[PDB]
Design a protein around this ligand. Sequence first.
Ligand SMILES: [Zn+2]
Ligand SMILES: [Zn+2]
Ligand SMILES: [Zn+2]
Ligand SMILES: [Zn+2]
Ligand SMILES: [Zn+2]
Ligand SMILES: [Zn+2]
Lengths: 242, 244, 244, 247, 247, 243
Amino acid sequence: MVYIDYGVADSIATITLNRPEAANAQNPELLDELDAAWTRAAEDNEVKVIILRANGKHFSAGHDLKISLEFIIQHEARRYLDYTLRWRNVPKPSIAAVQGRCISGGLLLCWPCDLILASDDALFSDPVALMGIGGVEYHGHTWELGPRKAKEILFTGRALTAEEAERTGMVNRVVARDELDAQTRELAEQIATMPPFALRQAKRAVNQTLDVQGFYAAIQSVFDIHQTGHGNALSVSGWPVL
Amino acid sequence: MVYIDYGVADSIATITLNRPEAANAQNPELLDELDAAWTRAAEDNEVKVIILRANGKHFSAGHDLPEKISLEFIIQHEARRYLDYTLRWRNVPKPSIAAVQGRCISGGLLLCWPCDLILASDDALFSDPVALMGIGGVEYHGHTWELGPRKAKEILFTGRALTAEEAERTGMVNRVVARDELDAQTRELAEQIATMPPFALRQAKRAVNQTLDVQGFYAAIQSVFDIHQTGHGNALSVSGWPVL
Amino acid sequence: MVYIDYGVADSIATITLNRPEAANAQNPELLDELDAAWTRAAEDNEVKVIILRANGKHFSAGHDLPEKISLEFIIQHEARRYLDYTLRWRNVPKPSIAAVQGRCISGGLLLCWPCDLILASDDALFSDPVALMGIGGVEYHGHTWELGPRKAKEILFTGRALTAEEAERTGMVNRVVARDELDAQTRELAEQIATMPPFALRQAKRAVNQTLDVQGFYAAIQSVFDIHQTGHGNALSVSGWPVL
Amino acid sequence: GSMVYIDYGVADSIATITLNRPEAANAQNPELLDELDAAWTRAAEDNEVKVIILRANGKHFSAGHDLRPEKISLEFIIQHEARRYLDYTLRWRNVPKPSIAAVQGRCISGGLLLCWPCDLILASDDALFSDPVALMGIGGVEYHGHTWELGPRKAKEILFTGRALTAEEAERTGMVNRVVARDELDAQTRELAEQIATMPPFALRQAKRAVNQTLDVQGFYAAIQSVFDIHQTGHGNALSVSGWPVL
Amino acid sequence: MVYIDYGVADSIATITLNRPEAANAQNPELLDELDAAWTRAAEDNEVKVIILRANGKHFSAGHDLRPEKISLEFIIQHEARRYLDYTLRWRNVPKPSIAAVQGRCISGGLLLCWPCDLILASDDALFSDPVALMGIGGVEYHGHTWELGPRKAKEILFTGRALTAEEAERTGMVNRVVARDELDAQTRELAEQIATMPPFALRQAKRAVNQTLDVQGFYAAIQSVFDIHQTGHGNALSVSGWPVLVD
Amino acid sequence: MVYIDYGVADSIATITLNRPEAANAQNPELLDELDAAWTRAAEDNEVKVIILRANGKHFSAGHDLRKISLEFIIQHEARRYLDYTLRWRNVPKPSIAAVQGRCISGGLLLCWPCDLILASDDALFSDPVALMGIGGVEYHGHTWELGPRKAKEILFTGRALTAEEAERTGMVNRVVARDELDAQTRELAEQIATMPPFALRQAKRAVNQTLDVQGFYAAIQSVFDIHQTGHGNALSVSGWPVL
Ligand SMILES: [Zn+2]
Ligand SMILES: [Zn+2]
Ligand SMILES: [Zn+2]
Ligand SMILES: [Zn+2]
Ligand SMILES: [Zn+2]
Ligand SMILES: [Zn+2]
């Protein structure tokens, strides 16, 4: 793998975004590698916990940017919707460690994790409105932030600090930048002492509550609204964005 | 009003589609008049029951089909006339009954589905072949609710017509009647309902419609409207026109 | 007890409405005895299946109708006997089968709808004409679930009865049978079901009921209970009596 | 542009709708509410308006519904309240452009129906939010935003006690987006509105829709309808006990 | 490969269950080859419609039942993959699919046809799920309540009886019933007719209906009942030491 | 009553857990007496508000654990851990839990069904039942009360939340000094009992019905079965209901 580093030790799989030269901007190849890494961790009976982390200053700058809407949907449904939900549902605990900028598409990498630790310098945003689109393809915003804060960041394009995100429940813990990796691995190690079936079913309990609340249906619903963004952009310019 | 007849007699308002020369195809002018008629009936205290019906052989052939049209522009117009109007009719707090004869095609379904009850003549044919134009069903997706998911997928995938008898079997149609008795049986039913206390009728309607909304009807209608709009998006991207 | 016969034999508990002289009309005493019967069957580990049936010609005519009566007073009584009892019967973790003959009117539906399966004689007639009294259907709104929304509105708006065959076509009735054969065929069905492992039956029942609750059944039943109470509220505000 | 009780102006793509009954602490009579609705419709239909600001003159945002026929039926009450307290409020919620409420001083009971349908809420540090309508025999106002905006435990707390939440308390539940100094409330609201108005209108429309449709899939429309009936049982009880719609 | 024939002709992909000597009973190898056929059909741009059919007298007798100490975890891991995830994946393939069901379709057989969009049944077809005999509350993917309504679903689960083609049609589970001799021909004719439609129209039509179902609670209910099914295996393990009940 | 104290004064019913010898761990007899106390309060027309509190240093250490089929376990747990809890939740009068010290696992089933929760500054809430092989307790308030990320964190790690952390998720209405908990709970109860009972009943209904429309009843039922797969697995591995 060119863009993703994978290691297993002490029952923990660590998946590292390794394209620091582009601020971990996501091309298709990177997303395919990342999905392969998640599947590896899912299928390795030695792995009890997964860490998602990133090299460099910034967790991820987002997606690396006649075209039909049909074509756009085919590609986005696979890599931005189905991959993300598949990661969400992997039956073992996962923790994202987020430093620096996590922008638009970056949210699709950390939101599917169960827990999020952020460094004090982390900044979460989704400014895709500038491009004519109503938020990224997988709409965690309302669930993670509450509707008022979700609209605030979509409408203004501003960034939320790590402490703001912690206040909405999107981030579990804010930690000093130099301690982010250490504190993440220590959490993962504590979780790995639990019986794997108990962790599987705890995760299932919370995620199934969310799905009964309408999470799956809402994610699908908003994916369609997202696609009208692209449809409008195409109708106006012939390009997927404004 | 040019296209819609409106009359009140014996506590009953009758709303009539009167464009038989175009098989009651729906332009914006007909829809704006139809909405004004629904409002008139809703606001007239002497009206207890509403009948929606149509002159001629066919109930409605559907929707009557700016250099660069934007999907934004399409959405604004369709959200007003095909979504908001339809839902407003659905929620009028008085019983309504649609009397459907002959062809009821695509947009025609948006006129009768918001009614509480539907009577159909034996010659009635219900269809939505808009897949032919590149779109996944009309703007207001009653299909799954009215027909069940398999029958909805069947008529959307094939563009075929359902008979009045087939529609009765799914529960979309309350009763099938002879063509020459359609108006008479509709009025007899309306009259029997109009003997009930208005507030009882209001809360019976509310009970069933609220059950539907709890089951997800409002949310699902809004959801499929966006799916519908991706159809227009795709067509605009391929041809520069809203349909294929 | 006074209004309800209870017996157990070959792993089947038979609960019989035994007030044929008032067409099994439901007063509080009868309902309390019925609830006690359901509970006794629920708690007896020898009972694998429950049959609910009725003596005389009619399953049930429905509910048998202090200075100033408050809405609060009505709510307290109705929440217990018409809402909580009915849901509790619904959730008893053993299969239950209602045998319905003749007229099952308004509150009569609260007795059979909570059973898992319903067998009806070919003379059975189901109705809810409570709109006549100013109310939007009975307290437990199974109508939309059992009949579909259009048929539910139809019977609430008109007060008309559905035959056994009409009810079977919506899925409310599992099987229509000759009047003379209703009991025998119910008993045989119970006996066949009682040969299954009790925990398989419990979880089959739970699978279906839980699908209903995810669909919104519990929430909708609670929502329409309030709509119903607005009926009593209006009747009180207009006459000082809970019904018009 | 303006009407009796509502001031209305457009400038730089922003429509500002101003409650203008400060001598009555913006108590809402039917006339004010019909005018407010007509203002929301004007801003919705005006293609030059990109963002809506809802604000209020005087010391208080709104004291709620104005208290000030032979036999009053529950039917009569439902007809009036369904129109002005349920249908108006939902329509404002659904206007396809961003809206921002600027809330100062008291926002009591029916006041909540004016700000809750806005997308964003900015509150001054002296803002106080409450719904003490339990004192009148009723289980919260007609449009039950409480559980969604505050969480169930806080919603029950304020309805059971009738107490006020400070602007900072409301911010912690996510009901208030930002708390600001009283003298800066108007300036900061305008500045936020101007920033939002630089965005493409269709991107804003679909962002708003994404969030509101998530809410509706979560059960928002259905729950609001459900609680409206619970509310009406309150009036039903009051009428049955006293012949008046409240205690 | 060994148990599944796959072919493409005139924009139609036909997947045939080819284990008639075991009444198309499903081992893991058959299920893996079946999932591979669905993926091959989904990924081929030249495929516009999918047919699922079966050789022999019977569509599928279901899961072929014939591990040191068996844990529930072990069963869940296996069933979640092949009975839940496969089935939902097939359900969501973004092209129309048609099942042609002849003869017996029992228990896990339902998992093969229920994910298809349309079902044509021969008049000889018999649908049943008698898995309560084994201690379990219906098969792993609970389409029963959706396809049949709750009273008919409970009836077939409580009794273990079969529904005729005609009974299934009356609940909406079967789209059409045809003569056993005409099943294959009528299915092909239906697929060709559908294959003349614009692929993106068909995709969004399928999506419109399936998304209505998921807003109604389909995905969440399927997940919820999966766990209820697993309590059946938990109980059986606790009573018989085996994943299903034995005499 | 052996384990539960019950008293009525000035329209307030006070229900006190009185098994400090086991940190108010819950056996079947304690749970039956608690359910009888809630029913008593529900039915007494002079009770307007209910307080649930606990003697000694700790609110409740959870279910008292000190061969069976899964069927047997489900029968017992559905009655006492699922049905009892939902019944308390739905009692048509305001209820307030006063929670001091440790509230562990099953303890949560006693306070969560209360409308409001006041906690002392030393209260600690946890659910470390993953240690026993089970995916959280039988009545899954966690996601509702804490949000999903915090719910997963406490179930995965087994750690305790402080009163102040619980307050930040909205699970706790107010944090008070230990010595003042009883007094602040009774004053809050007295204030609430000045309101019209029908208004309080319908305010309660409005919020709980919003929750049920959001999926609360359905979700609770769904997680019950997930919890029971915990027991099924434990039985399949160790012969016992836990690991
Ligand atoms: Zn995109
Ligand atoms: Zn259109
Ligand atoms: Zn009543
Ligand atoms: Zn009111
Ligand atoms: Zn299985
Ligand atoms: Zn347990």
